[PDB]
Amino acid sequence: QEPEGSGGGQG
C-alpha cells in the first residue's frame, strides 16, 4: 500500500 525505498534523506 505504501511506497517502497529505505532511504530517508540526508538528515
Added chain:
Amino acid sequence: DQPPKCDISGKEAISALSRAKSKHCRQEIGETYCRHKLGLLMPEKVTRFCPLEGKANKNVWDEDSVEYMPANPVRIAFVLVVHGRASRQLQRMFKAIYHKDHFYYIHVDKRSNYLHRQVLQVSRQYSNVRVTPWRMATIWGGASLLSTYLQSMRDLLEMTDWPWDFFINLSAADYPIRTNDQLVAFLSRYRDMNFLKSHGRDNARFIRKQGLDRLFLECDAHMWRLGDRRIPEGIAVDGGSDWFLLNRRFVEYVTFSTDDLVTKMKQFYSYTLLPAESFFHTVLENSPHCDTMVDNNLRITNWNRKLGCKCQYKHIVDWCGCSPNDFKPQDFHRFQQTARPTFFARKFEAVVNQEIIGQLDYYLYGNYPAGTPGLRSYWENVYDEPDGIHSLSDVTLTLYHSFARLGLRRAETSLHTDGENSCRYYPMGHPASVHLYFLADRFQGFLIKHHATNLAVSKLETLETWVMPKKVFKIFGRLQFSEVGTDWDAKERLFRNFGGLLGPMDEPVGMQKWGKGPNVTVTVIWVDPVNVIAATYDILIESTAEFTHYKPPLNLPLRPGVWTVKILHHWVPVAETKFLVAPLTFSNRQPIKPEEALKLHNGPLRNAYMEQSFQSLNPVLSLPINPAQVEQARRNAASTGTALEGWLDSLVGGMWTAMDICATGPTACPVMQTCSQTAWSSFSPDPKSELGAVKPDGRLR
C-alpha cells in the same frame, strides 16, 4: 602516514578521513576521492538497449488462476541472506518453504558465527541445501549486499546439478503467506517475467532520498559519504524494494554480459548506498529484457514510517534510513487480500510477537496434533561457548555467573533431609550457553547452562537454570507501565536489552507507557541506592502520546545497588519502578582487583550525578540519607573476591528468582528433573522448529 595522491578539499571527504580509524581505510578513502576528482571513477554516459519508449508494466487478477496443476513446474533457487540469533525462527520458516524439488543457498553474515553453526547442521542433512563458503559483513545499506547477490548468482549458475528457473531472496524475518503449491503454479504460468516493485512516487525525489546522487564507500563496516556525483546520461534510473524474483535468463544476462550497460552499472553501484534497491531495476528497464518487467514484487512490506523512520542507522552509514515494522496479530487480515498477487511478507520477529507467526503457519498448513509441546514458547540463544567469554561484556559475564550460582542455591534448599545433602554443588568454569525464554509473547527470563561438581559424590554435572526477574512496577490516570533499560528500539517500542542487565558505566533510559486521555504533566525522580536524588524533571504527556522516554545525563560511575524511579502528579504519588546497577566481578574478563573495584563501585567521579543538586527534596519526599548505609556502601566499594561475590549475589537474589533447575544427564540430586522432560528447558521438545526426514509429498511441514 603518507599524504594523499591529490589535494583533498571536499568537506565530506575530510570529515570521513577524520572519523576513519584504520590506516587502510583512510588510504582507500583518499584513493576513491582522488580518482573521482580526476573523472576516472564514475561513468558519465551509458548506452540504453531497450527498444521501448518508456516502461513496460506487464499485468498479471483472478484467485482461481493459482489452483491448476502444472505439467512442467518451475524449480526455485532460494537465496537466504541471514544474520542475528533467531535460529529457531529461521528453522521454522525454512520448514514452511521447503520442497525437495527446490534449492536453498544460505549466506550467513560473517559476524553471526552462532547462526552459521546452526545453518551448517541443516546443510548437512539435505542434498538440496548449501551454504556460501564466502561470508561478507552485510551492514545495512552497504555496497556489499549487491556483491553478495551477484556472487551468489554466479555460484548458482555454475552449479550444473541444480537446474533452477527462478531466483528468490529472503531474510530470517520473511514468511510465506501462500502455500508452495500456489507459488509454483503462479510462477509456472509466468516463467518469462521478472518481478520488481518500484518506489511509487516522484522519481526525482526518490533519487535524492536514496542518496543516489552521492558517492559512497564501504570500509571498516561503515558506509562513508565522500561527495556528489552526476547521474549518468542516456538511461532511465529507477528503484524501489530490494526483495524480488528474477528468472534464470535475466540472471544469466546480469552475470555474463559485457555490454556497455552492465559494465558501467556494476562500477556505478560499487560506490552506492542501498545498491540492491536500484541496480536491478535500472539494468532491467534499460536492457533487452525490459518488456518482461512486472511492477509487483509479490511481497507485502509492513511500512509504518511514523515509527520506522528514526534515522536509526546513523552510526553505520552517513545517511538516514527507514525500516519496515514487525507484524502483529491485528494484521492477519492483510494477508488474505486478493487485489494483487502476493506470496511472502516481512517483517516477523518471534521476540517481538510470535502469535501472528503461529496464526499464519497454521492457516497455511493446518494445526499441529493435539498434545504437541512448545507451540506457544520461544527460545533464542544469546551466548554460546564456542564464541568465547571475550565476546561477552564484563556486565553480562558477571551476571550470568551470578544467575548460575542462584540456581545452585535453589538446588541445595529444595532437598529436605537431616543427613548429607546430595544437592550441594560447586561451580566450575564459565557458562556454556544462555537462552532467552518467552511464553505466550511474555518474557520469562534467562536459561543458563553451566557445569558444577556434585559434592556428595564428587562428580561433574551439567545443568540448566531458569531465572526470572521479580515484578517491581507498582502503581484514574493514564499511566500504564514504566521501565528502565538500555538500547531502546523506537520502531518496536521496547528495550532490546531484554533482561535489563546494567553495570556502573551504563547510561540508563527511563520509559513510560500511556493510555488515551487528556494531556497531562508529571514529575520524574531518580533515586540511587543510598537515597541520593540524582535527577528530577517534568514532562508533558499529550493526549495522543503512547510512549515517552528520556535518558538523564548522569555522571559516571553509578553507585551500585537498587535504584528507584518515581512518578508524581503535583506531589501526588502515581507509580514507581526499580532497577539494578550491579557491581562487577570481572575486569577485561579477569577477576577484578582492589584498585579497580574501588574506582568503579564508589559512585561518580565527581561527588554528584549532575551539576544541579536536589538535597532539598529528600525531606519533602521522605527519603532521608542514612549515615550508616552510606558508610557501608563505601565499605562495599572496596571489597573483592568472596566479599564482593556475597554483595553481588545478595543484590541479584533480591531482584531475580531461580524458578527451577534441571540436569541434562545423570545426576545424584534426587529432586532434580531431567531437562528433556521439563516444559521450559532449551532441551525440551520443540517440534515446530525441528527438521526431520522428507515426506512422500516432498515436504517437511
